[PDB]
Design an enzyme around this catalytic site. Structure first.
Site, short mmCIF file in Angstrom:
data_model
loop_
_atom_site.label_atom_id
_atom_site.label_comp_id
_atom_site.label_asym_id
_atom_site.label_seq_id
_atom_site.Cartn_x
_atom_site.Cartn_y
_atom_site.Cartn_z
N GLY A 221 0.80 -1.29 0.07
CA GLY A 221 0.21 -0.01 -0.08
C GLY A 221 0.78 1.26 0.13
N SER A 222 0.32 2.50 0.48
CA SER A 222 0.88 3.67 0.40
C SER A 222 1.98 3.77 1.28
CB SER A 222 0.12 4.71 0.52
OG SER A 222 -0.40 4.78 1.92
N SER A 223 3.21 4.59 1.06
CA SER A 223 4.32 4.90 2.04
C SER A 223 3.72 5.49 3.28
CB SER A 223 5.36 5.40 1.32
OG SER A 223 5.03 6.67 1.24
N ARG A 224 2.84 6.26 3.21
CA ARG A 224 2.25 6.84 4.18
C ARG A 224 1.44 5.83 5.23
NH1 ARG A 224 -2.09 11.35 2.53
NH2 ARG A 224 -0.19 12.81 2.43
N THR A 225 0.82 4.93 4.69
CA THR A 225 0.18 4.08 5.69
C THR A 225 1.31 3.01 6.13
OG1 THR A 225 -1.85 4.13 4.81
CG2 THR A 225 -1.61 2.15 5.81
N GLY A 226 2.08 2.73 5.33
CA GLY A 226 3.26 1.78 5.89
C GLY A 226 4.08 2.37 6.79
N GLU A 244 5.52 -3.29 1.38
CA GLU A 244 5.90 -2.96 -0.02
C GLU A 244 5.11 -1.75 -0.47
OE1 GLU A 244 8.24 -5.14 -0.47
OE2 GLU A 244 7.63 -6.78 0.82
N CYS A 278 2.39 0.03 -9.03
CA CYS A 278 3.50 0.41 -8.25
C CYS A 278 4.69 1.10 -8.99
CB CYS A 278 4.01 -0.50 -7.19
SG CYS A 278 3.35 -2.04 -7.69
N1 LIG Z 1 5.99 -1.86 -3.61
C1 LIG Z 1 4.84 -2.47 -3.88
O1 LIG Z 1 4.80 -3.90 -4.38
C2 LIG Z 1 3.50 -1.81 -4.19
C3 LIG Z 1 2.75 -2.65 -5.31
C4 LIG Z 1 1.66 -2.27 -5.76
C5 LIG Z 1 1.09 -1.02 -5.07
N2 LIG Z 1 1.62 -0.37 -4.34
C6 LIG Z 1 1.04 0.80 -3.68
O2 LIG Z 1 -0.19 0.82 -3.19
C7 LIG Z 1 -0.76 2.22 -2.88
C8 LIG Z 1 -2.42 2.37 -3.36
O3 LIG Z 1 -2.93 1.28 -2.82
P1 LIG Z 1 -3.64 1.31 -1.57
O4 LIG Z 1 -4.58 2.87 -1.69
O5 LIG Z 1 -4.49 0.03 -1.19
O6 LIG Z 1 -2.75 1.55 -0.36
P2 LIG Z 1 -3.24 1.68 0.95
O7 LIG Z 1 -2.07 2.45 1.89
O8 LIG Z 1 -4.17 2.87 1.01
O9 LIG Z 1 -3.89 0.44 1.79
C9 LIG Z 1 -3.37 -0.97 1.57
C10 LIG Z 1 -3.92 -1.76 2.92
O10 LIG Z 1 -3.62 -1.29 4.26
C11 LIG Z 1 -4.70 -0.75 5.07
N3 LIG Z 1 -4.93 0.26 5.64
C12 LIG Z 1 -5.52 1.48 5.16
N4 LIG Z 1 -5.60 2.58 5.95
C13 LIG Z 1 -5.01 1.96 7.27
C14 LIG Z 1 -5.09 2.49 8.43
N5 LIG Z 1 -5.29 3.97 8.79
N6 LIG Z 1 -4.57 1.75 9.42
C15 LIG Z 1 -4.22 0.44 9.23
N7 LIG Z 1 -4.16 0.03 8.02
C16 LIG Z 1 -4.81 0.66 7.16
C17 LIG Z 1 -5.91 -1.20 4.09
O11 LIG Z 1 -7.39 -1.22 4.34
C18 LIG Z 1 -5.26 -2.32 3.12
O12 LIG Z 1 -5.68 -3.78 3.14
C19 LIG Z 1 0.51 3.19 -3.47
O13 LIG Z 1 0.94 4.28 -2.80
C20 LIG Z 1 1.27 2.25 -4.30
O14 LIG Z 1 2.43 2.67 -5.19
C21 LIG Z 1 2.94 -0.57 -3.82
#
Ligand SMILES: NC(=O)c1ccc[n+]([C@@H]2O[C@H](COP(=O)([O-])OP(=O)(O)OC[C@H]3O[C@@H](n4cnc5c(N)ncnc54)[C@H](O)[C@@H]3O)[C@@H](O)[C@H]2O)c1
Ligand SMILES: NC(=O)c1ccc[n+]([C@@H]2O[C@H](COP(=O)([O-])OP(=O)(O)OC[C@H]3O[C@@H](n4cnc5c(N)ncnc54)[C@H](O)[C@@H]3O)[C@@H](O)[C@H]2O)c1
Ligand SMILES: [Cl-]
Ligand SMILES: [Cl-]
Ligand SMILES: [Mg+2]
EC number: 1.2.1.71
Lengths: 485, 486
Positions: A221-226, A244, A278
């Protein structure tokens, strides 16, 4: 009513109602109540109860089940492609390739497991040294919305293979894809509690991430969330976290002989999946001068003709909608904002259907923008930077905290060799589009794009830990004792 | 004359607080200098940064040649290095010599591990070539421990330099002389200016280095308390790679076995080698209730009371030497007193036979009756015994710890060992072999509170370089079939 799958049965949610909406027409595609904290605990406890027997069974039995899962996916491929399309807007041709990636993940994961986390044995003096690898226990998988089947599958498959049990929390934007994926696992024979599905939004994700019963958390997911998750785990090294995250990926395009080939490669890099991979190119570096101008003008002309439409539209579109109206609105404001700071729209992004998340590609020259955001724009908005010489291109390509992918289009092998040396990314391509990395290779970004736990081929490394054993059938005295005894 | 910090190819005097290391027995000053202050730490990080591009660029074979010259230099200076390890840590010369040998041997195994785990692969994929390479991170800090003041930092430094990183090494403030001589060997081997830098000091120095924004990685061996603080500090900063090798509370389960003498010897090697200062030492001995277990313990006590404890260069050679400082000795004795206060029975009371010296004789305490037993690592020769009713109880107790470094079973039953493996929760799990002395050819990493899933030894390669996946073609081209919609 059948929303969560816990300990081998479905049940209704008790938390807030969640709906996913078709990104174009806004119709409800799926709804259900999210998992509350109590149900999240039930999911973790289910995985915990299943873990000992799952971990204990022979590897070949886990392999058989994963293989049956891939075969079940294959047999339901059209249906799953359709659901991916319905929920994400991805055209059917592209959704089909996602399903194919999910099927292929099993055999590749088995190969990686034997290579990276297998078993070895050898003499060491009088005894035998054995290396084995063992699963962590219960792991949470957090899914993204962009590859709602393939990316969670890239954690779930190697995790289950190693003997972990999983609680899967899908993106709240793509619950229906996850539901159907679970149906394939279930049809394939997966034992109760081995894989549990908890659907929901923020509250569900928060409760699972906080749960002390987890031994690991695998996240895309996003670097913000991660980063939030990483901060949350600070001081708890006992729980393995694999992150990731996103990127701000540069594509450097030197003057090359086959200009049309380069334009096509740029489009596949920037606008495939409507710019929601990504690895999509976010910044295009193009040299100053006439050739660069011709390259850009051809790119703009061809990009304006790209078919953008509904997932099941015919003739088939090249790309579909972004994931929601909210995401489309946010991208249009980013474009507006950059233009306000002096960016020049070589091709302005538009939203051709009012109230639909369809966006046409955007190409913005940001060369004249003083302070350029080091921000990931998750959609079809390509920023262009014109450069004076190759050293300035490399400097710009590296001017980001992220480090997922980078690429060079150049007829010069010497130039690519330099690019490799100076690059700061997990994926570095030469004359090939940035997108479509193969599962046979590790896939991990550096800098803000990861936490040094690369996935794909190397996912095995974070799904099991090594156990080194020295073994002898009886205790015994050495021929010569240590002094002092 | 003294040699303090080594930064950008030069020896520099320290500007921070005075630091002395003392012989743990006689208390004589073994090494003395001023610690590196924050501006000297910055100079060392900058030196590594300036050296990194050229060092990383160099052909792998040229980095290998330097590392091999280093190993050969350690071999030539092996006696000198063993005596300095002995002087500073108290470890007997026979054991110190084995540490130097482990240092020498680390190079060839690290090269093997690099090619296996972080090598280069190339093959056709569709109409392109898929290439896998691995690249170094950049500047890495290495924090050294005192128990293996040459081998354990060398186990981070060798693979890190091999992969093309440059290093800033902050040794334990208890073993600076060992690090100084180690640097002198690297220097004699031809190490390029800035590729390995040495900043000596106490907490002032270690805090400044761990905080420095110029690091790309920090590789640590030391206590769980300190490692956890580093982990906390890096929370929210996933861009910096952290490898944490921490301690444990390692159980050794002993079933009734036919060779009682061999069992006792194996327990002694597991519990008391290095005066109990290896991170793999047995901290808890699980012994079945009943007559045989009582006999095993009676023999263990009798033999342990006769083990020679003494100065590093004493002849006849001692089995074990002092713990690292008077303070450490104090802490261990207090721990023994506290446990007996709470109900532990001294089967063999640990003593400090010489006033003013950190020599301790082995302790064996039956803690079975102690209510709330601390899950704590006692870094010294204090073995806790728990009597168990049945094998399932032994496994339960073995696993009743937040740590997870090593565990072992002495048993004549292969079936019992198979079950032990299934239920164990440790990175090292031995059958009928002492818990101590793990092979460099295998990964070495503890789970739970003992690590952060970045095992070292053979898998150190994994944290010293990151994979770079490439798809390559000599020119851009069009597919035979375009994607739809174009
Ligand atoms: N390096 C990689 O492999 C890779 C691959 C594909 C996509 N991405 C990425 O994914 C992104 C967007 O997809 P996305 O919107 O699903 O990312 P995301 O951060 O919004 O969410 C991913 C997930 O984490 C969770 N989550 C969301 N908010 C949370 C919180 N406040 N607290 C705890 N968990 C929470 C979800 O509900 C979920 O299953 C990018 O910024 C992007 O480039 C990275
Ligand atoms: N898993 C492993 O491989 C392994 C192997 C052998 C020993 N150990 C262990 O090493 C230990 C004891 O050695 P130690 O006394 O050197 O541990 P330690 O934590 O006190 O020291 C190791 C190091 O980190 C530093 N440091 C100390 N305090 C710091 C602080 N407040 N802030 C920042 N840095 C700081 C040092 O000065 C140094 O170079 C154990 O607890 C133990 O089991 C671990
Ligand atoms: Cl060339
Ligand atoms: Cl991809
Ligand atoms: Mg059915």
């Amino acid at each position: 009513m059948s929303t969560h799958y816990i300990a081998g049965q479905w049940l209704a949610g008790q938390g807030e109602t969640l709906e996913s909406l078709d990104p174009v027409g806004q119709g409800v595609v799926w709804s259900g109540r999210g998992a509350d904290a109590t149900q999240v605990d039930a999911a973790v406890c289910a995985a915990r109860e299943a873990f000992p027997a799952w971990a204990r069974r022979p590897l070949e039995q886990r392999i058989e089940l994963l293989e049956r899962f891939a075969a079940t996916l294959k047999s339901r491929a059209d249906e799953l492609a359709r659901v991916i399309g319905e929920e994400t807007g991805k055209p059917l041709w592209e959704s089909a390739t996602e399903v194919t990636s999910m099927v292929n993940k099993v055999a590749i994961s088995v190969q990686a497991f034997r290579e990276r986390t297998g078993e070895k044995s050898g003499p060491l003096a009088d005894a035998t040294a054995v290396l084995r690898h063992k699963p962590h226990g219960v792991v949470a998988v957090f899914g993204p919305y962009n590859f709602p089947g393939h990316l969670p599958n890239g954690h779930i498959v190697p995790a289950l293979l190693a003997g972990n049990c999983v609680v899967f929390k899908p993106s709240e934007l793509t619950p229906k894809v996850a539901e159907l994926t679970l149906k394939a696992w279930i049809q394939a024979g997966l034992p109760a509690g081995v894989l549990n599905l908890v659907q929901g939004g923020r509250e569900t994700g928060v409760a699972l991430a906080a749960h002390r019963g987890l031994d690991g958390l695998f996240f895309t997911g996003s670097s913000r969330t991660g980063n939030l998750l990483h901060s949350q785990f600070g001081g708890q090294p006992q729980k393995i976290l694999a992150l990731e995250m996103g990127g701000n990926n540069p594509l450097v395009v030197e003057e090359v002989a086959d200009l049309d080939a380069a334009v096509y490669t740029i489009i596949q890099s920037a606008f495939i999946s409507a710019g929601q991979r990504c690895t999509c190119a976010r910044r295009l570096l193009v040299p100053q001068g006439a050739w660069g101008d011709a390259l850009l003008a051809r790119l703009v002309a061809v990009s304006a003709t790209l078919r953008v439409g509904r997932f099941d539209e015919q003739p088939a579109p090249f790309m579909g909608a972004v994931i929601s109206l909210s995401a489309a609105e946010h991208l249009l404001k980013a474009q507006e904002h950059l233009i306000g700071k002096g960016a020049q729209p070589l091709l302005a992004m538009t939203q051709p259907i009012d109230g639909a998340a369809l966006l046409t590609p955007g190409i913005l020259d940001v060369s004249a923008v003083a302070e350029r955001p080091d921000e990931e724009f998750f959609g079809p908005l390509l920023q262009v930077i014109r450069y004076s010489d190759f050293a300035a291109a490399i400097r710009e390509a590296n001017a980001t905290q992220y480090g997922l992918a980078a690429g060079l289009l150049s007829d010069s092998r010497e130039r690519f060799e330099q690019f490799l040396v100076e690059s700061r990314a997990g994926i570095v391509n030469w004359n090939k589009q940035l997108t479509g990395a193969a599962s046979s290779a590790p896939f991990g970004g550096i800098g803000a794009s990861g936490n040094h736990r690369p996935s794909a081929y190397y996912a095995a490394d974070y799904c099991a830990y090594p156990v080194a054993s020295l073994e002898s059938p009886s205790v015994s005295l050495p021929a010569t004792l240590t002094p002092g005894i």
